[PDB]
Amino acid sequence: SVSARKIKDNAADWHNLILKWETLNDAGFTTANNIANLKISLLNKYNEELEKLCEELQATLDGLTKIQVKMEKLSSTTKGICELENYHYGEESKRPPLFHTWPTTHFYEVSHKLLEMYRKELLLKRTVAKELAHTGDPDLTLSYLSMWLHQPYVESDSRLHLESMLLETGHRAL
Amino acid sequence: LYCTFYGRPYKLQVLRVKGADGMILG
């Protein structure tokens, strides 16, 4: 019951942080489409409006950086139980009582993979926000907006993997 | 020194400062 409370804590933390990431990405795509429309509307034919749009894009980015620091705190938390338990149980314990059948190394594998995808996705978003207001080629602007919208460093299969944790924490009904 | 030029971050290092009383530092 000691480890049970923290595994069902971390599953709920993973689910709510993914939903807050999605809401912040939708607001960021609306503001990036506005600043692209403003730059093409001047180039077909200001600095206070452009600087204001850049400042609130930076506000969206520091919100995402806060979410990234929370995901960092979630994986080190889980890594610990790995050691403590594995060591104390020592070997002579090929019977670890978890919830249904998993060991904790699968929880390390799932949290490590999700941390790697969201950590690379934040660096791609930082490069898009760095280079978006200074380009002039509209193929490159459509490319940069597509990299914001479609999120190419996040696999779909990991979302299936998150459902495996929700079948192994019992928040959802079986 | 930090500034953000239209979203792009810029970092500068101050080497020499000369002021209006006529003293030059290093």
Which experiment gave this structure?
A: cryo-EM
Resolution (A): 3.5
Q: Which of A51, A57, A130 sits opposite B8 (nearest CB)?
A: A130
CA atoms within 13 A on the CB side of A105: 2
Nearest-5° angle of CA A153, CA A156, CA A157?
A: 115
A36/A31 Cα distance (integer angstroms): 9
Distances A78 to A3, A109, A163 between C-alpha atoms, Å: 10, 10, 18
Q: Do the Cβ atoms of A130 and B7 come within 8 Å?
A: yes
Which of A108, A101, A124 shows the shortest CA–CA distance to A161? A108
Say what angle helices A2-43 and A47-89 make with each other, to 10 degrees. 160
Give the C-alpha separation, A164 to A167, whole Å.
5
